[PDB]
Amino acid sequence: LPTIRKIAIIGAGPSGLVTAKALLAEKAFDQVTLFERRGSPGGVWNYTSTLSNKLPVPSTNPILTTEPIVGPAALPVYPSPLYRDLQTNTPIELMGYCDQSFKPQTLQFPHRHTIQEYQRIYAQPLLPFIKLATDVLDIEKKDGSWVVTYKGTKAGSPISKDIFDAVSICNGHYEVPYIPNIKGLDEYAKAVPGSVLHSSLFREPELFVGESVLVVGGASSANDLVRHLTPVAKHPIYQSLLGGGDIQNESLQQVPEITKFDPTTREIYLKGGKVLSNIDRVIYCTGYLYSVPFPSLAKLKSPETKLIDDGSHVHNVYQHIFYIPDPTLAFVGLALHVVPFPTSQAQAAFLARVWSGRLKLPSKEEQLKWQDELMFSLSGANNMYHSLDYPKDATYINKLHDWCKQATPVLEEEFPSPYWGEKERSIRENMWSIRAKFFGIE
Amino acid sequence: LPTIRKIAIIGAGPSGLVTAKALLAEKAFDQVTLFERRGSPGGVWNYTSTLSNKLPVPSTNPILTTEPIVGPAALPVYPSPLYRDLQTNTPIELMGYCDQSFKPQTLQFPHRHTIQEYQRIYAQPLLPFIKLATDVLDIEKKDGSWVVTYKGTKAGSPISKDIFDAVSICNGHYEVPYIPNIKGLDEYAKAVPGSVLHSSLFREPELFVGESVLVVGGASSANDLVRHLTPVAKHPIYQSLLGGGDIQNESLQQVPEITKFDPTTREIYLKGGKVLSNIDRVIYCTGYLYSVPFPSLAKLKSPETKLIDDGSHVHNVYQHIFYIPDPTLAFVGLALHVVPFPTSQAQAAFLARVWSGRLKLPSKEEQLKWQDELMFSLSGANNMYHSLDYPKDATYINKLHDWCKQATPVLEEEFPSPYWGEKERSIRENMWSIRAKFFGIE
Ligand SMILES: Cc1cc2nc3c(=O)[nH]c(=O)nc-3n(C[C@H](O)[C@H](O)[C@H](O)COP(=O)(O)OP(=O)(O)OC[C@H]3O[C@@H](n4cnc5c(N)ncnc54)[C@H](O)[C@@H]3O)c2cc1C
Numbered sequence A, B: 001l002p003t004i005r006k007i008a009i010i011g012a013g014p015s016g017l018v019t020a021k022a023l024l025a026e027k028a029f030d031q032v033t034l035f036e037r038r039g040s041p042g043g044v045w046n047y048t049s050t051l052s053n054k055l056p057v058p059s060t061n062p063i064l065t066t067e068p069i070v071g072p073a074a075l076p077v078y079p080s081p082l083y084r085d086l087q088t089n090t091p092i093e094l095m096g097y098c099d100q101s102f103k104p105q106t107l108q109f110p111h112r113h114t115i116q117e118y119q120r121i122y123a124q125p126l127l128p129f130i131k132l133a134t135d136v137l138d139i140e141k142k143d144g145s146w147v148v149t150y151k152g153t154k155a156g157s158p159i160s161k162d163i164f165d166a167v168s169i170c171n172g173h174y175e176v177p178y179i180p181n182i183k184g185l186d187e188y189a190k191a192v193p194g195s196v197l198h199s200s201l202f203r204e205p206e207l208f209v210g211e212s213v214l215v216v217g218g219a220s221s222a223n224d225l226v227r228h229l230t231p232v233a234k235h236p237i238y239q240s241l242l243g244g245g246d247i248q249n250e251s252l253q254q255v256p257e258i259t260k261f262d263p264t265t266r267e268i269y270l271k272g273g274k275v276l277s278n279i280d281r282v283i284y285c286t287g288y289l290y291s292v293p294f295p296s297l298a299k300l301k302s303p304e305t306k307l308i309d310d311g312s313h314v315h316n317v318y319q320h321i322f323y324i325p326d327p328t329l330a331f332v333g334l335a336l337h338v339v340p341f342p343t344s345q346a347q348a349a350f351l352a353r354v355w356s357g358r359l360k361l362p363s364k365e366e367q368l369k370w371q372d373e374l375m376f377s378l379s380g381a382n383n384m385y386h387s388l389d390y391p392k393d394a395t396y397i398n399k400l401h402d403w404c405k406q407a408t409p410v411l412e413e414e415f416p417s418p419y420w421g422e423k424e425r426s427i428r429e430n431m432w433s434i435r436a437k438f439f440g441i442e
């Protein structure tokens, strides 16, 4: 239905939260309800000393259900992948919503405590709009509306259903781990319970004192882990890069991809003949998979209606937001290689004006063309589908900003669209160098 | 031995950390080593979504060993009693060390996030002096020194031993739960696994939505819990006060102490005949027990050498710091009803000057007299032994401030002793009113 009055937001993390404020700023909707399985908003910024109960090794299925840690004396806990000593890899000049600045004297790459407090503040006025400790089981178009099925998190809660005109899925994409099925991995992992970890389980580095570790992966997370393990793990630290690396010294030995895990001898074979033995911990820093764990959406498999396939990305979403077949279904926060808060805010502001009717989407065929062209430029690398590495991200948010400006009628209070000027872009372009200089690395 | 060179500090929380800086500032010790079972410093300020594995119900033994939650993929976690939405009950104008202020724009009674960050900043330069993830098993005077036995937290670590000339115990006193043994409690607790809780298990209030709750206790913690449960628990919330209470309305029904727990009818008898039934959760906010879990110290039972008896306090400690029989053994952080950070700094400042010899303690008989007089003024209420409720804390910290000022020789850099002038004392005196007005309560 075009006239949208009741909206459901799946998730109360940074993306769902900014989506709510933008929607509520339209003064056009009668109901905006956020659903959150955690007892509080903030998404992954809810640091949990608790680890996931069972790591799937290997992990290649994007539909995997997240099992919360439960007990008789506590609300169920959904572990967050944030680790103890984490500091941002995004500067305060760029991260964070454009209309809530950081307090003065804040470190440029602050500890998570600062971001957890920043989110707590941001979300406080939204609490009455959120159904906390509530897990959304399924989402499906029935008649002319969306039927969202959910169950209160808490033993004995009854399954319930409510219907909305639109649904914005902001469930995040850093929950289902991605661990490639390698020869002998499974058996290797099960023979020694904590010998095979993933980055989502990392919390405290003191666990690795004296141990010989093999970090697998070459992304930012893998490199960050190597630096964090360097002062504690036994030297050297091994890092398995896809094409091998140029660093081979006393503290770090970069090696090629893994060929096979020898369950019997506990040896690890690397492409090129190199073989590692006596590895106490193998930590996969291979990222996660996109997920749409809602049976009615997950079953969709046709090229024009599918959302998920291999979890490399979410398909059929115009501008990475609107589900082409039916734009009353949207996503906020799918962007990869971006500054999270600002980017989700740019999408929320646009999403709000389109759903209220102050802005119109181009034709269904044009939206589909936008996709064809993207798919073509990916040359088969679908995990880059939602990637907006600079300058794509700067251009993207400025594009959404300029579009939002065209909304009509003009409202007395306009929910802002972030905008990156010459200065903001320069910082984003040299982000990793500014970060490297801040932490005295590289 | 009087010439102290090597000092061991048990615990790397607010107390052990400020004791480290005060000691190092004397420039008179060759070795200052902090031991800490947790992976990081900061004491209880390490928020843990992880609950204690097994709540002892009832709990009356102060020697009870703290069991950390362990797993094959993580460093052992020692759950903290801090809850999710916790904000301080001490204003920034007084809490915190006198030589480290809070950043600008900090809330008068900040969320734990702010305080966890504060402790992180304060403890950072001390990381190389702390043996992290290390549990001290025992402490005993052997020959002329103190032998401290410890084991690295982490499966398989070997039991190790090191000697020191002095030992400062800063193990905290809010770990071992105190739950009075009432008739039928044990059975009533074991019948329904999560029916009986302790304040140390509280984390997220959404777990109590719709439930009927009995909060037992009249101290601050109990009243805080009542307010936090008010918007979620089924009305009214029951609070068992020792002498009953004056509040009886739709949302809060204060009642007298508990007489018995009827396992069979799950009924709760209150002094005066009043009986409660259909209580989903009973939350004991009856506080904690002081604990000295070191065999060589816990076995001491003679009047002149005992440290712990019923866990109401730690005996034989001159000024709540020096163990009278052997002052090379001291405690920091025992104070009750005080503003923690400053008060522990006031002690550390004094302890440091005494142990380096720049200050001298009075005679042993004069120390014992100080204790006799304290015991006399207590009138049998031993759990008030370490209580320094204003103006006692104000006078105490200022007394230590003035003593430290007499240390000689003067050092180029003098570790500061907090001091509470007319302004400070004022805030301390009306602290609970200022707090009430801040959170708009009472
Ligand atoms: C290790 C790590 C480090 C990071 N460091 C930074 C950094 O330094 N800077 C930065 O800007 N970003 C960082 N990020 C990125 C982070 O993803 C974003 O900051 C931000 O959390 C994006 O949030 P969201 O709402 O899109 O996702 P999330 O924070 O993942 O929130 C999703 C929310 O939806 C809920 N939810 C999911 N499914 C359901 C369901 N079925 N029913 C009900 N609720 C559901 C979740 O429980 C959760 O609260 C990091 C991420 C990781 C994993």
Ligand SMILES: Cc1cc2nc3c(=O)[nH]c(=O)nc-3n(C[C@H](O)[C@H](O)[C@H](O)COP(=O)(O)OP(=O)(O)OC[C@H]3O[C@@H](n4cnc5c(N)ncnc54)[C@H](O)[C@@H]3O)c2cc1C
Pocket: B010, B011, B012, B013, B014, B015, B016, B017, B035, B036, B037, B038, B041, B042, B043, B044, B045, B078, B081, B082, B083, B087, B088, B089, B090, B095, B134, B135, B136, B137, B170, B171, B172, B173, B174, B332, B333, B339, B340, B341
């Ligand atoms: C629910 C709650 C709320 C509070 N709110 C406030 C507040 O708002 N403001 C305020 O000022 N104070 C508050 N406090 C008080 C708090 O006790 C102090 O702020 C501060 O933590 C004092 O710490 P410490 O070093 O004395 O103790 P702790 O913080 O308890 O630290 C003791 C440390 O020693 C370690 N340890 C113990 N035994 C051993 C061993 N055998 N071997 C190795 N390490 C060991 C522990 O693991 C721990 O890290 C609160 C306390 C609780 C329980």
